[PDB]
């Protein structure tokens, strides 16, 4: 029962009990004890799932605050808007730290120490995810340089995915799904989004490792495509 086996196990207790912030701290201590050695497949997923649930709740709250704000601004009730603007500012500064916490961990050790192609596309995609989450709320010059880092990290992940990983590889299908989503809402290009996610979907159908894991993304890819292609408006 080493200290590394202690924190990997204690992360599953915070994961099972929805104590995700502490689950991040446990996996953070797992990473900040390694030189040029990378995390195992489970430890890799653990940390990423831990940060996923954390940033997911913060994002949900931000979308809700932005929506209520844009209604009060649509009404013109200014004394309420100034309060929602201040409240959203607090949420956005947390998101800065949450993305800073993983990006400065991806940039420091996870990406350089990635040896296999599976870990390269993994940690590269992760960078794009949290840089894309910054582009959701950041405005002005920060948004431009955020989507720059989102597009740059997603592209390098695609080079490694298209030459080393198989089309049905989860790490590759998930990369392409996030890639298409980045095109649709952040760059507002449906054809750049659809052509990337149609290309990646059909190469998984043509080629077809248990695919229950992959087909979960294949159902989320086709769902995205189909609803986009529909002429109706969100």
């Amino acid at each position: 029962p080493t200290a590394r086996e202690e924190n990997v196990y204690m992360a599953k207790l915070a994961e099972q009990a929805e104590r995700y912030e502490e689950m991040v701290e446990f996996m953070e201590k797992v990473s900040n004890s390694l030189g040029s050695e990378e995390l195992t497949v489970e430890e890799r997923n653990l940390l990423s799932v831990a940060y996923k649930n954390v940033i997911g709740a913060r994002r949900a709250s931000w979308r809700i605050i932005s929506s209520i704000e844009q209604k009060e601004e649509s009404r013109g009730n200014e004394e309420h808007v100034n309060s929602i603007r201040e409240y959203r500012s607090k949420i956005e500064n947390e998101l800065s730290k949450i993305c800073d916490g993983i990006l400065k961990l991806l940039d420091a050790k996870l990406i350089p120490s990635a040896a296999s192609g599976d870990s390269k596309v993994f940690y590269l995609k992760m960078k794009g995810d949290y840089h894309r989450y910054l582009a959701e709320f950041k405005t002005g010059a920060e948004r431009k340089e955020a989507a720059e880092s989102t597009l740059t990290a997603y592209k390098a992940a695609q080079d490694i995915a298209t030459t080393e990983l198989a089309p049905t590889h989860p790490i590759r299908l998930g990369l392409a799904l996030n890639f298409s989503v980045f095109y649709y809402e952040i760059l507002n290009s449906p054809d750049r989004a659809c052509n990337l996610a149609k290309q990646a979907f059909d190469e998984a159908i043509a080629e077809l490792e248990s695919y229950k894991d992959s087909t979960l993304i294949m159902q989320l890819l086709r769902d995205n495509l189909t609803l986009w292609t529909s002429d109706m408006q969100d």
């Binding site: 979308r63 998930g174 799904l177 996030n178 989503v181 649709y184 809402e185 993304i217 989320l220 890819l221 769902d223 995205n224 609803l227 986009w228």
Partner: peptide, 5 residues
Amino acid sequence: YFSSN
């Protein structure tokens, strides 16, 4: 808020 992973 389209599907993502």
